[PDB]
Design a protein around this ligand. Structure first.
Ligand code: MG
Ligand code: ZN
Lengths: 653, 50, 1318
């Protein structure tokens, strides 16, 4: 439109370097405007930076500065919010100066009070009705003049209440004056409209440009402004012009901040109305878009899955997903070798998906990690880098040890992935964010990556003992011979025995001291000792190794040995624990959960105790309040007896 | 409650014990869901403080 | 055992016998809508009551009216089959009759000349289907049953933190059905108040003053009188004995020369008893005692002529002297005490500024609607129309019953609108609750919770339409002079049609049918909903109501509720539930009159259940229904305790009364925990329809109930014999039943072969019956999606073995075999939905393909002559389904351009391409193409071919009936005429004429069917032709896809492992699945383990039957083993035997019983541990339930014996094809330079401020900035970063964020200057 909310003259042109009429439509003539039509020439995204204005007929007031919280218009003038709110409308005017007439300098008054006061004096005293009264009082109230009186009044007036109250007002007035912004600019004379491209017209069903919340609110402010602008020229009466001033003030107030007021629409198939406050707020303050960053390029996600074959510093990245993620790097790698003649040819090859393109993917995914990330990021371990392992499948293969850090159960919870471009980010990903480096947790000294379920169960199955088994009493050389007997199935995996083992130790200052002795240890413990890399003692292996003891072994190796050997040792514990679990083949059946034989006897005694307590109530001795405490103690004690009976039976029988 | 849950998960649980036990699952689900909001609210202000 | 069930019977356990059977599950939807849509000759919840409320109306004192007599629901424009495929609303015309009247001026009630015209067209209200669904625009939708607080009084507590000083509240809220909410609440200073429609606070004295009551009458109505006599110039009073209790004695109490109570001690029971026994009503009191108590009534001076003491004011020494000196004997003054009669009304009257009715009415009008000036007309109208009115306010039958029951009134029903006495009674009752007496009412109790439905909701929305048009009719009737063209013109269709259609079209209650599972279909209808219009919101309340209550027991399910934000709000309806006539939910109980338990049932409401005592379901029945145990467990008013035998008034109907249909389908429910039972029930709804529908082995009982009631499987209308069995149609000759008025031949049921559903799932019915098998009434003809042999399937039974396997089955993962995916069992068919419709531009009409320009021969070859894709073709990503050629020409042909157009030859001259293409990612094959060409435009080659296909389909089934109907007349003549072949002359013409009339009826019926295909052209303005292609796609079970059981055990496939590597038993059969043992101890789900052990015994017995069938041991061997396996144990679980040992039925039963004989275990009273052990021992298996499964890859035997069985798995609809996505470069959003949306086009994966802190915790700032600068915003940054990565140089030039530049401009747009300095 010629002078609309979307415009060529006011806002900006449609096409890139072209006029609306179509006279000057070339890059050669890029400075000059149009002669016939009203429109300049520029880029397609010049509308989003450019803006216009709307000349208000009556002086309006701002939405925030009126309300907000402390009321900056009220505290500057020195008056209450209730009187200022009523003064802003058109029901009760405020007096503007005049010490001759018997009235205050900022005194509110009713229409009847104004009529009675005007009859006596009329002239000399003055009192504007609406926001023009606040605009007149704003520029009249001098900051420098009031500051001089406040300084003298503070020293002169010897009092606690007077000095304390005056100090707060003087500091706020001095800071407001010293900044630059005067009181006259709080009330709005001109209203700047927003860029058109930043409030675009979304098409409805059937291709109809429906008006957005911005466009509807700006339309209302223009309609009431054009109404009031003519009414002043027409010379309408005081009631009609005052009513137009209210709706103009309400239209501007609703546009600037739609809240704590009349509120437009309100659940009329489109919520309230996106005001200028609600765009700056949005999703409870502009966090998601600006501060957070929102969605990112070179990103993806898929359903998680088990990955025991993949070691601690890698993950199973999908082949189809990884092709799109490193799409720019395939164009460079193909063109560098000389397969693709140009960018257009390189685009055609990767889209068609030829056999040669798959070999290029592995070439640029060797020393280039992938930042895996879960949705609920509680701590730093919620984001971590891994080496991208190529695998034929859409599901992402997460590591077993890293699962404890994420707290990621594999029951339909998709983890996102990110591709770090450039060198310094890849160096930061490989150094700082790496899983091999990030072993210990930030909150506590204990290890984050540790044995959880399958590794812990298999470790207990291997590292264990019994009363009697096949090949118990038999001495042997070492773990190589002990493994041969256990794997073949002559000697049992868990049995009482004694075998030799050269246990190393770092006793001296920076030196590995040798040692050897025929220590008492089981067949499974002898086979499990091979995972312990040299320096670890024999006392740690010869044990149950259940959760706490297993986790303590990883922490002890980190302090003694270092980061390198513990990273390998923690991996081998997972491989040994996973393999040992398959050998045992445990299974919680129906008959496995064996209840105690004295449950019926304990239940009869507990039930009889309740009848004895109930018998005392009907008799006379026991009371209603004492019955609740007595019955609860018997029931709680019976549960302990039943639990202890099951604990005694199931543990050792 | 007055009458405690006598029967186990291995044995056949009666209707009264299930109708009593359903409150613990419903309330426990609400408290854990509410605790997740409290955890998200707690880590917000602790992060903003430092 | 009837037909269909004779093919396969489940061995049902559970000692509790079903006295009262399971009713029709989808009753609540049908019976409520049946009450709505029905001609009722009385005041009930229906259409007549919706009319009759505002039916007889008249003009503004003009003597002109239009009374409504009755209505008439006409025939549907299209049936359910034709309406669904076309794309329109399924509705019937509402022919509302009327009677215009006009009384004579200056004359009595007598009409001059009335005109009772025909029934007015008031739109088309939507009708309900057979299964219980509404078809809105060719899609099945369901309205959820709303729940909220019922109309009537309700004294709330609001204790604890009322004023943050340990002070409990005392408020009451008179909620109406229609009108403003009458709320009243207390204050911290113990003063009355009121709030009209949840508005700001105000004094309570303004309410009574507005309804014509004085200051003296206000205190007299609320408050004891306490008369104070004046005998011989001295203070006296009528001393009530009961009044002195709970107070210290001020003065010396004496009467007739006898000191009753001394001045010091408190008024005990001994002091009060002396005055009451002696009956002394004349105690001499002091002047100082009257200072505290205020005067009740006014008393002006007679001689002097002035106000001595006003009404409602505190007395004094000076005030009492003036009254006594004037000459006043009587002197009323309020009991007024802190114990019982607290000073609430007296204190409220002082604070209230308005005295008169005009002052109170002006303040009330100004309080509700501030700004505008009050006056005589506005104040009286606003106060009256708020409560005391017929049109605006309405409490209804439910409100008047609830309000009278709360207040303890005599009459059950009465007037709708409130009165001065009812408001005064509510104010007096509210004051009693704040004082002490009368405890508060609970919100969680189901007596207050009114369960509304689609029938009642449709009546309310229809009532809104009548009041809207009523204003137009009242205005138009007064303006019009003569009564002519009145009834058709006045009652407009648009106000009535648009109002009611808005409810079904778009609302919170009315939503799309969750149709990806027959159990999900049936349970969505049987659904209670708290949130919605009328009920409380999510943000409004989040306590008490969410928690389960003790009043439920079979009204709503305690177990079934969706885990998330709405935890406990969206409740599921129970199995044996039923809605009452009033509104509240009911539940059946057997009437136990004295010792003997009677057979007659009774539906007890929520409030009616409290006073009676109800016995449990699990109870040992004696002879003649006697009490076996002495002290049986019987719940009484919430709490549970062992009551007496004779004291039991009621008892439970069935063991599956409390549990819902979805919860009842879970076997071994009692063995699992309520947490996992809740999770397992929700995952049961999301099961995708499988290809090969296998029957469940470990059943329950509700499998056969859900399959028939949901309407997936095609149930038989009338019994008979099958004439012609086929995949397309299944006809059947009735024979026995037949039609009533002669004629007829056979029934017909066209099965839906491969159609799209709501959530992109393949709906496909399949015939189960034989070539000519007998069938009874209420028996399945064709099995629908996710059904088998007239029973619910959901998923498939698979062999499972709980053991760890190299860390693959970790946490919640399954290790499936290659034999599962190879057989195509878990593979499922989907159905996409594409469409192409755009036309009617100013330049010209957009043609439908017709050889598009600038495309190769490969693209054009796949399309036909008309320009549409063929039936059955591999539509890959990029190929054209439906072509297009938009007119964007008229460019003026130059010498160069004219030669180029003629030489090239693209189309008519030159046109822009806007053809439909298959999205880049999805792929499959085309199964069906529908074309909806608008009226006026000529039909293309494809549209006429599809119309001809439907015409020849409509010709075939109608002509198929004619072969039987015409043969009835034809074959009859040859029977009779040969016997007598003078006599046959007159009747000979009648036989030929009746034959031709029946033949003409076929031509008339075929013409109507043939026309309906042609004329049926639904299309909007600016729509010429609308093609809709349906692309079918197959997706197998792969690693990453969701899969779970019924016991709350979710799973995701780690890797599809070959069968050689898998574990195998002694016989060599490889196990299908391998679950994790570690999950079962922590998560209490013992039913999952028990399901495997019974599943092993179920298959073990079935493998014996298959072995007997394979070896062929005749009917003698099979019949003996089948009868023993049916009974198996020894208890009292019905146990239907062989009965007679059938010849054909026994052989057919053994065939379906092979490869897994199913066994049903109920929800509460399921199969025992010892009974399952005997079942395993019967069919060759161990008691422990485990076998030595040797390793596949290794070869050697396992250490421990692994448990093996058949736990029921079902694949959830959460596939990797939909879930997986990646990105790099594409389309960004316009407002802020960021990725637009997420699904398709360009990537998402929102980073958020949470992941920024994780990146900052490490300290890699270069990694963090690249997310929100290089790879997001900044115009120069994106081009530089992409080009640098393309060249292989890397590095980055981030610049400023464009989103930050918008934040400055949004800040600059609201008069706040902000800018980057330097
Ligand atoms: Mg989980
Ligand atoms: Zn121009």
């Amino acid at each position: 439109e010629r002078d609309g909310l979307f415009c060529a003259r006011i806002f900006g042109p449609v096409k890139d370097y072209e006029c609306l009429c179509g006279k000057y439509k070339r890059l050669k003539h890029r400075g000059v405007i149009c002669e016939k039509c009203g429109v300049e020439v520029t880029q397609t995204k010049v509308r989003r930076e450019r803006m216009g204005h709307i000349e208000l007929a009556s002086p309006t007031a701002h939405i925030w500065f009126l309300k907000s919280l402390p009321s900056r218009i009220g505290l500057l003038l020195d008056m209450p919010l209730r009187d200022i709110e009523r003064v802003l409308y058109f029901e009760s005017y405020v007096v503007i100066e005049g010490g001759m007439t018997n009235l205050e300098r900022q005194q509110i008054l009713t229409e009847e009070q104004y009529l009675d006061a005007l009859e006596e004096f009329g002239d000399e005293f003055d009192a504007k009705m609406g926001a023009e009264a606040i605009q007149a009082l704003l520029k009249s109230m001098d900051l420098e003049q009031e500051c001089e009186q406040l300084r003298e009044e503070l020293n002169e007036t010897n009092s606690e209440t007077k000095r304390k109250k005056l100090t707060k007002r003087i500091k706020l007035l001095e800071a407001f004056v010293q900044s630059g912004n005067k009181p006259e600019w709080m009330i709005l004379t001109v209203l700047p409209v927003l860029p058109p491209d930043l409030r675009p017209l979304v098409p409805l069903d059937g291709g109809r440009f429906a008006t957005s919340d911005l466009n509807d609110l700006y339309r209302r402010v223009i309609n009431r402004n054009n109404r009031l602008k003519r009414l002043l020229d027409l010379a309408a009466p005081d009631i009609i012009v005052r009513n137009e001033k209210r709706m103009l003030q309400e239209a501007v107030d609703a546009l600037l901040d739609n809240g704590r007021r009349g509120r437009a629409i309100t659940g009329s198939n489109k919520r309230p109305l996106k005001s200028l406050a609600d765009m700056i707020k949005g999703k409870q303050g502009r966090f998601r878009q600006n501060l957070l960053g929102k969605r990112v390029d070179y990103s993806g996600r898929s359903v998680i899955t088990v990955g025991p074959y993949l070691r601690l510093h890698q993950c199973g990245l999908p082949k189809k997903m990884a092709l799109e993620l490193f799409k720019p790097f395939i164009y460079g790698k193909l063109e560098l070798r000389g397969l693709a003649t140009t960018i257009k040819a390189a685009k055609k090859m990767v889209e068609r998906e030829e056999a040669v393109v798959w070999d290029i993917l592995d070439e640029v995914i060797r020393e280039h990690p992938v930042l895996l990330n879960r949705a609920p990021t509680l701590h730093r371990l919620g984001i971590q880098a891994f080496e991208p392992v190529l695998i034929e499948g859409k599901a992402i293969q997460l590591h077993p040890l890293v699962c404890a850090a994420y707290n990621a159960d594999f029951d339909g919870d998709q983890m996102a992935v990110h591709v770090p471009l450039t060198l310094e980010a890849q160096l930061e990903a490989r150094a700082l964010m790496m899983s091999t480096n990030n072993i210990l947790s930030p909150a506590n000294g204990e290890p984050i990556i540790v044995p959880s379920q399958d590794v812990v169960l298999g470790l207990y199955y291997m590292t264990r003992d019994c009363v009697n088994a096949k090949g118990e009493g038999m001495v042997l050389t070492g773990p190589k011979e002990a493994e041969r007997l256990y794997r073949s199935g002559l000697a049992s995996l868990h049995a009482r025995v004694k075998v030799r083992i050269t246990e190393y130790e770092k006793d001296a200052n920076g030196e590995l001291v040798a040692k050897t002795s025929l220590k008492d240890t089981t067949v499974g413990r002898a086979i499990l000792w091979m995972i312990v890399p040299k320096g670890l003692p024999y006392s740690i292996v010869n044990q149950a190794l259940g959760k706490k003891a297993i986790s303590k072994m990883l922490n002890t190796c980190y302090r003694i040995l270092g980061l390198k050997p513990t990273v390998i040792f923690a991996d081998q514990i997972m491989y040994t624990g996973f393999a040992y679990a398959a050998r045992s083949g445990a299974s919680v059946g129906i008959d496995d959960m064996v209840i105690p034989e004295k449950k019926h006897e304990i239940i009869s005694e507990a039930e009889a105790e309740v009848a004895e307590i109930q018998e005392q109530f009907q008799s006379g001795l026991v009371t209603a309040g004492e019955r609740y405490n007595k019955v609860i103690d018997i029931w709680a004690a019976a549960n302990d007896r039943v639990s202890k009976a099951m604990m005694d039976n199931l543990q050792t029988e | 409650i007055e009458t405690p849950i006598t029967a186990n998960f291995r044995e056949g649980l009666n209707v009264l014990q299930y109708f009593i036990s359903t409150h613990g699952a419903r309330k426990g689900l609400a408290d854990t869901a509410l605790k997740t909001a409290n955890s998200g609210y707690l880590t917000r202000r602790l992060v903003d403080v430092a | 055992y009837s037909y269909t069930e004779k093919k396969r019977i489940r061995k049902d356990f559970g000692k509790r016998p079903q006295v009262l059977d399971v009713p029709y599950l989808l009753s609540i939807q049908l019976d409520s809508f049946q009450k709505f849509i029905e001609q009722d000759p009385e005041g009930q919840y229906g259409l007549e009551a919706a009319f009759r409320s505002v039916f007889p109306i008249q003009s503004y004192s003009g003597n002109s009216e239009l009374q409504y007599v009755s209505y008439r629901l006409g025939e549907p424009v299209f049936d359910v089959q034709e309406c669904q495929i076309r794309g329109v609303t399924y509705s019937a015309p509402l022919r509302v009759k009327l009677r215009l009247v006009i009384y004579e001026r200056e004359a009595p009630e007598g009409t001059v000349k009335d005109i009772k015209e025909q029934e007015v067209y008031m739109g088309e209200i939507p009708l309900m289907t057979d299964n219980g669904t509404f078809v809105i625009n060719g899609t099945e939708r369901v309205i959820v049953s709303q729940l909220h607080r019922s109309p009537g009084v309700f004294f709330d507590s609001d204790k604890g933190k009322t004023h943050s000083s340990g002070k409990v509240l005392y408020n009451a809220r008179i909620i109406p059905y229609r009108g403003s909410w009458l709320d009243f609440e207390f204050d911290p200073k113990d003063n009355l108040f009121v709030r009209i429609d949840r508005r700001r606070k105000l004094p309570a004295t303004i309410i009574l003053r507005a309804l014509n009551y004085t200051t003296e009458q206000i205190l007299d109505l609320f408050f004891e009188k306490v008369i104070f006599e004046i005998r011989d110039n001295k203070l006296q009073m009528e001393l009530v004995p009961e009044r002195l209790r709970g107070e210290t004695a001020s003065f010396d109490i004496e009467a007739n020369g006898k000191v009753y109570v001394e001045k010091g001690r408190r008024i005990t029971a001994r002091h009060i008893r002396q005055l009451e026994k002696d009956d002394v009503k004349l105690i001499e009191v002091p002047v100082e005692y009257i200072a505290g108590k205020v005067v009740a009534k006014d008393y002006i001076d007679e001689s002097t002529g002035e106000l001595i003491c006003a009404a409602n004011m505190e007395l004094s020494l000076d005030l009492l002297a003036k009254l006594s000196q004037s000459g006043h004997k009587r002197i009323e003054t309020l009991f007024t005490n802190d114990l019982d009669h607290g000073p609430y009304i007296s204190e409220t009257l002082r604070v209230d500024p308005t005295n008169d009715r005009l002052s109170a009415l002006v303040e009330i009008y100004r309080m509700m609607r501030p700004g505008e000036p009050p006056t005589r007309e506005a104040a009286e109208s606003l106060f009256e129309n708020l409560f005391f009115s017929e049109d605006r306010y309405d409490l209804s039958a439910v409100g008047r019953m609830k309000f009278n029951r709360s207040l303890l009134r005599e009459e059950i029903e009465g007037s709708g609108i409130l009165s001065k006495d009812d408001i005064i009674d509510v104010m007096k009752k509210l004051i009693d609750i704040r004082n002490g007496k009368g405890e508060v009412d609970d919100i969680d109790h189901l007596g207050n919770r009114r369960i509304r439905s689609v029938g009642e909701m449709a009546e309310n929305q229809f009532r809104v339409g009548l009041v809207r048009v009523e204003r137009a009719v009242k205005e138009r009737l007064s303006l019009g002079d003569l009564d002519t063209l009145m009834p058709q013109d006045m009652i407009n269709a648009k106000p009535i049609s648009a109002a009611v259609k808005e409810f079904f079209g778009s609302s919170q209650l009315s939503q799309f049918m969750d149709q990806n599972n027959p159990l999900s279909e049936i349970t969505h209808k049987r659904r209670i909903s708290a949130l919605g219009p009328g009920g409380l919101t999510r943000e409004r309340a989040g306590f008490e109501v969410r928690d389960v209550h003790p009043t439920h027991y079979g009204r709503v399910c305690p177990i079934e509720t969706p885990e998330g934000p709405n935890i406990g709000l969206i409740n599921s309806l129970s199995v044996y539930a039923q809605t009452n006539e009033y509104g509240f939910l009911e539940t059946p109980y057997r009437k136990v009159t004295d010792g003997v338990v009677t057979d007659e049932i009774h539906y007890l409401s929520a409030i009616e259940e409290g006073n009676y005592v109800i016995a449990q379901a699990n109870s040992n029945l004696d002879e003649e229904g006697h009490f076996v145990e002495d002290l049986v467990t019987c719940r009484s008013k919430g709490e549970s305790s062992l009551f007496s035998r004779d004291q039991v008034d009621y008892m439970d109907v069935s063991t599956q009364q409390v549990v819902s249909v979805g919860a009842s389908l879970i076997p071994f429910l009692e063995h699992d925990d309520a947490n996992r039972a809740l999770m397992g029930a929700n995952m049961q709804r999301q099961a995708v329809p499988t290809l090969r529908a296998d029957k469940p082995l470990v059943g329950t009982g509700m499998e056969r109930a859900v399959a028939v009631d949901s309407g997936v499987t095609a149930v038989a209308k009338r019994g008979g014999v099958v004439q012609y069995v086929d995949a397309s149609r299944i006809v059947i000759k009735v024979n026995e039943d037949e039609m009533y008025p002669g004629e007829a031949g056979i029934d017909i049921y066209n099965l839906t072969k491969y159609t799209r559903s709501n959530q992109n799932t393949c709906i496909n019915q399949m015939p189960c019956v034989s070539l000519g098998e007998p069938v009874e009434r209420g028996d399945v003809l064709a099995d629908g999606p996710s059904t088998d042999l007239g029973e619910l399937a959901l998923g498939q039974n698979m062999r499972v073995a709980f053991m760890p396997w190299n860390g693959y089955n970790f946490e919640d993962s399954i290790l499936v075999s290659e034999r599962v995916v190879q057989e195509d069992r878990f593979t499922t068919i989907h159905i996409q939905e594409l469409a192409c419709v755009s036309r009617d531009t100013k330049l010209g009409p957009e043609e439908i393909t017709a050889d598009i320009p600038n495309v190769g021969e490969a693209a054009l070859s796949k399309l036909d002559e008309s320009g549409i894709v063929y039936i059955g073709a591999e539509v890959t990503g990029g190929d054209i389904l439906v072509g297009k050629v938009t007119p964007k020409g008229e460019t003026q042909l130059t010498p160069e351009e004219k030669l180029l157009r003629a030489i090239f030859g693209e189309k008519a001259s030159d046109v822009k391409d806007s053809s439909l293409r298959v999205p880049n990612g999805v792929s499959g094959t085309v199964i069906d193409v529908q074309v909806f060409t608008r009226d006026g435009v000529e039909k293309d080659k494809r549209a006429l071919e599809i119309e001809e296909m439907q015409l020849k389909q409509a010709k075939k089934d109608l002509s198929e009936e004619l072969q039987i109907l015409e043969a009835g007349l034809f074959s009859r003549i040859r029977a009779v005429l040969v016997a007598g072949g003078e006599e046959k002359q007159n009747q000979l013409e009648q036989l030929a004429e009746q034959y031709d009339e029946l033949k003409h009826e076929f031509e008339k019926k075929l013409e109507a069917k043939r026309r309906k295909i042609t004329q049926g052209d639904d299309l909007a303005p600016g729509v010429l032709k609308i093609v809709k292609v349906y692309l079918a796609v197959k997706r197998r079970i792969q690693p990453g896809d969701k899969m779970a059981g019924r016991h709350g055990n979710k799973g995701v496939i780690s890797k599809i492992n070959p069968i050689e590597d898998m574990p195998y038993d002694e016989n060599g059969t490889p196990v299908d699945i391998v679950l994790n043992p570690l999950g079962v101890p922590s998560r209490m789900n013992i039913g999952q383990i028990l399901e495997t052990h019974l599943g092993m015994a179920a298959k073990g017995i079935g493998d014996k039957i298959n072995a007997m069938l394979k070896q062929q041991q005749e009917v003698a061997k099979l019949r003996e083993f089948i009868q023993r396996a049916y009974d198996l144990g020894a208890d009292v679980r019905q146990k239907v035997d062989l009965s007679t040992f059938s010849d054909e039925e026994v052989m057919r039963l053994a065939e379906n019983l092979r490869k897994g004989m199913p066994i049903a275990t109920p929800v509460f009273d399921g199969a025992k541990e010892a009974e399952i052990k005997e079942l395993l021992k019967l069919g060759d298996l161990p008691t422990s339930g485990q076998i030595r499964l040797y390793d596949g890859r290794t070869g050697e035997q396992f250490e421990r014996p692994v448990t093996v069985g058949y736990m029921y798995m079902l694949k959830l609809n959460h596939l990797v094809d939909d879930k997986m996505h990646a990105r790099s470069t594409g389309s960004y959003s316009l407002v802020t330079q960021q990725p637009l949306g997420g699904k398709a086009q360009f990537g998402g994966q929102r980073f958020g401020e949470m992941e920024v802190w994780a990146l900052e915790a490490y300290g890699a700032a270069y990694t963090l900035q690249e997310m929100l600068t290089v790879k997001s915003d900044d115009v120069n940054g994106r081009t530089k970063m992409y080009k640098n990565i393309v060249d292989g140089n890397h590095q980055m030039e981030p610049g400023m964020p464009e989103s930050f530049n918008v934040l400055l401009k949004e800040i600059r747009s609201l008069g706040i200057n902000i800018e980057l300095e330097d």
